[PDB]
């Protein structure tokens, strides 16, 4: 997490960094298969180390509140 920043940048700044990055680094459930092996490949790029599926997702999350509203509509 934020620990790399030492005592720099202030609370809000780094707290949102850990938060964003903890969610960012969580185990994510693959869309193709059902396994929790999705890892961020780059900015908005996600892949499943299991089946190798490469998906277009949020920047720091595979699914964005809005991406989900799409499915329904």
């Amino acid at each position: 997490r934020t620990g790399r920043f030492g005592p720099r940048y202030g609370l809000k700044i780094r707290v949102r960094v850990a938060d964003v990055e903890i969610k960012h680094k969580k185990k994510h459930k693959c869309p193709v298969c059902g396994f929790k092996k999705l890892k961020r490949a780059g900015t908005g790029i996600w892949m499943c180390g299991h089946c190798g599926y490469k998906i277009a997702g949020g920047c720091y999350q595979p699914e964005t509140v809005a991406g989900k509203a799409v499915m329904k509509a």
Partner: protein
């Protein structure tokens, strides 16, 4: 005095230009004779240097290989379709008319065929509201209601990479690396921090603008700075 920074920009010199030669593709909708038959498969997901968002590489039936503005949810292997009869799933492109009202859409054309202009940045999306034989009313991310030719093609879904803005750059260094991938002079020196000769706000024994900051729309370039034709300022009220 000397031209202010806004005036140097116009000249389009190196410092101000965007690293075009480093860009990948001009994401635009394909051209289909008609029929809609046109389909293709997602071969790969690449990062777009010009938009700091993902972009999908697609191989079409007729051999055409082109990059595409990828909406959230598109992966490798997926099959995308483009045309009047395209299915109604995310990633597919078809005129606003064939699109069902109430569905999120991105990369909308202003006039049919222009290849898409509206809603293309990270995680944004338009909202098709009203249909008609004549007009297609779409709400752009700015919140505006845009009356459009129901013929204008658009892509289903929301643009990929949503949430980019949620994380702070944290440090100059990070802005630096981003700015270098854009057509912008950075960092920014405050006018009020300059000399009279260099900016209408420059000069004084202390820093403060000379006159009020709201300037008339008619102001000439060189003088047009600060709050442009502001309809109001501040937060109060």
């Amino acid at each position: 005095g000397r031209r202010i920074q806004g005036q140097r920009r116009g000249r389009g010199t190196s410092t101000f230009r965007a690293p075009s030669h480093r860009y990948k593709a001009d994401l635009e909708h394909r051209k289909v004779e008609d029929g809609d038959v046109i389909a293709g498969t997602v071969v790969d997901i690449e990062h777009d240097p010009a938009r700091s968002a993902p972009v999908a590489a697609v191989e079409f039936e007729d051999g055409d290989r082109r990059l595409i503005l990828a909406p959230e949810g598109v992966g490798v292997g997926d099959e995308l379709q483009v045309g009047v009869d395209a299915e109604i799933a995310p990633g597919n492109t078809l005129p606003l008319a064939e699109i069902p009202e109430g569905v999120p859409v991105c990369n909308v054309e202003s006039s049919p065929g222009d290849g898409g202009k509206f809603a293309r940045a990270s995680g944004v999306n338009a909202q098709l509201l009203t249909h008609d034989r004549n007009v297609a009313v779409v709400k752009l991310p700015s919140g505006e209601m845009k009356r459009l030719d129901p013929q204008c093609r658009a892509t289903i879904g929301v643009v990929g990479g949503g949430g980019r803005t949620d994380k702070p750059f944290v440090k100059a260094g990070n802005k630096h690396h981003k700015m270098k991938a854009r057509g912008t002079k950075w960092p920014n020196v405050r006018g009020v921090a300059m000399n009279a000769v260099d900016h209408p706000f420059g000069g004084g024994g202390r820093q403060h603008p000379g006159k009020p900051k709201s300037i008339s729309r008619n102001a000439p370039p060189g003088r047009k700075v600060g709050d442009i034709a502001s309809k109001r300022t501040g937060r109060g009220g």
